[PDB]
Amino acid sequence: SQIPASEQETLVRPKPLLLKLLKSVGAQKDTYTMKEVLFYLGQYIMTKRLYDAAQQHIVYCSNDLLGDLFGVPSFSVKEHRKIYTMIYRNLVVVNQ
């Protein structure tokens, strides 16, 4: 397996619940880069209006597909490493 050119270019296969979330906002494929997963997660949060309207780094997701995948009722976008580890639990790394 070749090392990805950057972390953003890591190729991944979302597990079934994350895949369901991605398809709900229009994703069509089974394999994605990490960058693509992050863009689709952002789009999910905006289209479902999950962010606090006044303090927009706070996301509320209790019992949403997203809260079920992350295991939390809310989180801060500023917690970069916590968000990455929550995402990583929901996918498998693949070749290329």
Partner: peptide
Amino acid sequence: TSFXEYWXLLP
């Protein structure tokens, strides 16, 4: 700051 600008700092 917009949620879109906060999230853009992840990737």
